[PDB]
Amino acid sequence: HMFSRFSNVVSEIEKKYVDKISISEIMTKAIEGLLSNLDAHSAYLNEKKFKEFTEGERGGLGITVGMRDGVLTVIAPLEGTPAYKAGVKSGDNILKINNESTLSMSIDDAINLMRGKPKTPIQITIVRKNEPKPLVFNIIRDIIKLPSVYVKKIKETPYLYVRVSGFDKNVTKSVLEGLKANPKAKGIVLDLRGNPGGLLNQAVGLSNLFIKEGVLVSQKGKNKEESLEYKANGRAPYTNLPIAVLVNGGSASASEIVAGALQDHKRAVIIGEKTFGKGSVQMLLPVNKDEAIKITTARYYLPSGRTIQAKGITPDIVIYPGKVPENEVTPKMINDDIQLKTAIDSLKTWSIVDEK
Amino acid sequence: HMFSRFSNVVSEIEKKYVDKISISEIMTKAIEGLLSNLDAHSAYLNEKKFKEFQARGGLGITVGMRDGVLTVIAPLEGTPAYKAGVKSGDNILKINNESTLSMSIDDAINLMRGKPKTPIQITIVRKNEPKPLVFNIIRDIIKLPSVYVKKIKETPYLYVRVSGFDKNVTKSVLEGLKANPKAKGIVLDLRGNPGGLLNQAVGLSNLFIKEGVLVSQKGKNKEESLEYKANGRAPYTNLPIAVLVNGGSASASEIVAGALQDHKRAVIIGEKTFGKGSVQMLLPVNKDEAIKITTARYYLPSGRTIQAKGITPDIVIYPGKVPENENKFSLKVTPKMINDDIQLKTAIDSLKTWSIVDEK
Amino acid sequence: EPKPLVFNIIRDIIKLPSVYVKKIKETPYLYVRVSGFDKNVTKSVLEGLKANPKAKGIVLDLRGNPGGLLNQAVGLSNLFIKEGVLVSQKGKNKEESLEYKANGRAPYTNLPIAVLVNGGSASASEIVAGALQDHKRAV
């Protein structure tokens, strides 16, 4: 008799609502309301919209989305996508996708509406923090290769700049060989800004390149039988070399696990802005073949034990982007990127301390 | 197997969800989600928060939802909220420490209701503003002097304002009309009027409409079919009347505006109104829960509904000042104010041609 | 203006196309303009109205009309006034005191009409506008 309060209500809804309503509508709206109210990323695949999920190499817009403070936002436009080329920035609230209001629209619905074939156009209405009126974008989609990792030397300094815009399947291998290719290097600038995340095993593997021992990241929850804890093995190549990590509001998921692991192990300095805070994991629960729900089944926890979604990553050195004031391969860009100049400066003091 | 797909889902949630949740919370958050998705005004009174209906301090704004966001329909004239600078169409973004997204229409009112001395802050977004606006207002009792009539100087007409549909709107208008016998026309200003009780909109309309259906409550069940007529005789059935409406006119203000419009009893001047034609009722879900949902919708004498579209005026005029080719060369009871209000001056212009046409 | 304005202009012949009737789109009304009182104003206005059975109202633009001959002002006004005085020339000599009235043959005694005038309306245009205003025949 405990689930009676639901049967009690649909009786009143059938009779005293202004419109007569089919129970078919009652039930799709039944499952919608519970999923959406509990969790932002908890979305619903319908009685027919299951198989809807041989997709091939489809195209898309190239923005990763999440929901912060109940409203959908762009985590970061992936560098090199038509959305990145269009002028989208991190933290931008999506208000309408193709004149369709994202109000009470789940994260997955927004992703699917922007995904399709590379030639299809798409409109997005957005609200930015410092704009008088909402901004309208007319952009064409594209295929997403995403060249993740390249290592460059910071000229006139012994350091080198390594950028990871996303967690491809080849990030640990490409980063390691990029370091192996530079014996003369005395420091690293690891740019994880604008990286919306990726797969966990490449976040753990990249962090294992710098951490000898200790906890690295863990998935925990009420069921301790389903409580994964990743640690670092003793095979860490670069246990001494300086490293300065850069993060901003576009850093999410995997990039926060490695940045938080380095920060918590006091292995690196974190420069930039407070990150987005995407430390949730969802899971497909198969309601047979007709329906599937997505709900968060676990959360991510750092080597310090702190959770990610509630707070994100607070950097050790806060710096808003912009140009370096003056007085009148990475040269000149250091002046056009004040955050990069700070990460190099934090390495420069490390090289001084190591003079013992 | 009527409820088969709902019990089927919660089974996976109980076992494979990240957090432990009592079935009591699973159901309250289920039914809240059901209530909210069907109707904007459909809100929820809890297992304990029901029969908490006992009584008037507050902020003084009437709120509604049309496109998923809570907005101020119009700040009640003379309230401390009106004093703060609130305007129509402003999205309410934060009431206290709660982002108003997925906060029911009823819940937002409760946070603004309290004792008249307590202060309260509200975060608001306006249509043309770069960053959110912060308003710190103190609550107060709402007396709201609803109706006043003033003579329009240098014209034989008079200006009637109704800021809200008090229990005294038909009486105050009527006595105002008898108190100026030689008046030859009316400017009925319903702008910024977010509504009021239904019977005072019908009674005011009956003050000028001789015959015909006037407004209707209609739902899918025909057992709930109230039909309002002009069952009484109308004292002032001939004198001209020009009604002003804008984006802040809603419900009752639209009912009287549409009734006069549909019967060709008045000219409707201004902008499209807000479009709130629903009425709710307290429904007892046993003793634990109670729901507020729309029990009927309003239909005009023309048969058209009021919620989907509102009222489209006969003459559109956007607000501002009346132009003057030498308005800064001259620069160093309603006279001259007509020059500061282009909408009011147009309603006077339609009365002046009306009084000319009646010269037959 | 702060200083007097100087104009260098070349002259021309003056035909002056006085009357044309146009329909006001998305309304049942029509716009009739009279920039001057040609010898053909009553005839052209009447046939312009005769050409539009579906019309429910008139906008009579007399702005910028500096005047014209009296008989076409009286004739145009007679198109809308059934009876009553229409315009008069008076003075000390009552032997030379002309008074024009309207004959009963007025075609459009019901149809709405809104007249427009400005600082450029003079002479004839004021006789017809004043006649319609005084008879409460137009706005």
Tab-separated table of N, CA, C and O in Angstrom, chain B residues 352-353 355-357 359-360, chain C residues 109-110 135-139:
chain	number	residue	atom	x	y	z
B	352	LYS	N	-12.198	60.878	-29.100
B	352	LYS	CA	-12.583	62.118	-29.769
B	352	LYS	C	-13.240	61.848	-31.114
B	352	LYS	O	-14.156	62.575	-31.520
B	353	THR	N	-12.775	60.825	-31.831
B	353	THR	CA	-13.450	60.434	-33.062
B	353	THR	C	-14.744	59.690	-32.775
B	353	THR	O	-15.691	59.777	-33.562
B	355	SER	N	-16.819	60.327	-30.184
B	355	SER	CA	-17.793	61.366	-29.876
B	355	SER	C	-18.229	62.121	-31.126
B	355	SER	O	-19.353	62.629	-31.176
B	356	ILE	N	-17.354	62.217	-32.133
B	356	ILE	CA	-17.730	62.843	-33.401
B	356	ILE	C	-18.680	61.943	-34.180
B	356	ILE	O	-19.646	62.420	-34.785
B	357	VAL	N	-18.406	60.635	-34.206
B	357	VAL	CA	-19.264	59.709	-34.946
B	357	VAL	C	-20.665	59.674	-34.343
B	357	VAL	O	-21.665	59.571	-35.064
B	359	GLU	N	-22.251	62.009	-33.404
B	359	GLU	CA	-22.970	63.215	-33.793
B	359	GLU	C	-23.708	62.944	-35.104
B	359	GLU	O	-23.360	63.431	-36.184
B	360	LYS	N	-24.725	62.098	-34.980
B	360	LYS	CA	-25.635	61.768	-36.062
B	360	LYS	C	-27.068	62.105	-35.655
B	360	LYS	O	-27.407	62.075	-34.471
C	109	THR	N	-23.075	59.667	-47.900
C	109	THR	CA	-23.540	60.324	-46.682
C	109	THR	C	-23.232	59.523	-45.420
C	109	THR	O	-23.363	60.055	-44.314
C	110	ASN	N	-22.802	58.269	-45.557
C	110	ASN	CA	-22.556	57.363	-44.437
C	110	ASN	C	-21.103	56.962	-44.298
C	110	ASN	O	-20.654	56.702	-43.179
C	135	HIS	N	-19.777	70.169	-40.026
C	135	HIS	CA	-20.923	69.282	-40.162
C	135	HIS	C	-20.735	67.980	-39.396
C	135	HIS	O	-21.633	67.129	-39.415
C	136	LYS	N	-19.590	67.815	-38.731
C	136	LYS	CA	-19.267	66.584	-38.025
C	136	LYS	C	-19.381	65.393	-38.973
C	136	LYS	O	-19.811	64.301	-38.599
C	137	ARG	N	-19.005	65.632	-40.231
C	137	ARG	CA	-18.988	64.627	-41.281
C	137	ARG	C	-17.675	63.859	-41.343
C	137	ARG	O	-17.663	62.721	-41.826
C	138	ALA	N	-16.589	64.429	-40.822
C	138	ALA	CA	-15.278	63.799	-40.888
C	138	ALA	C	-14.470	64.196	-39.662
C	138	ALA	O	-14.825	65.128	-38.935
C	139	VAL	N	-13.389	63.455	-39.425
C	139	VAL	CA	-12.392	63.790	-38.410
C	139	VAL	C	-11.219	64.494	-39.078
C	139	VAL	O	-10.747	64.066	-40.138
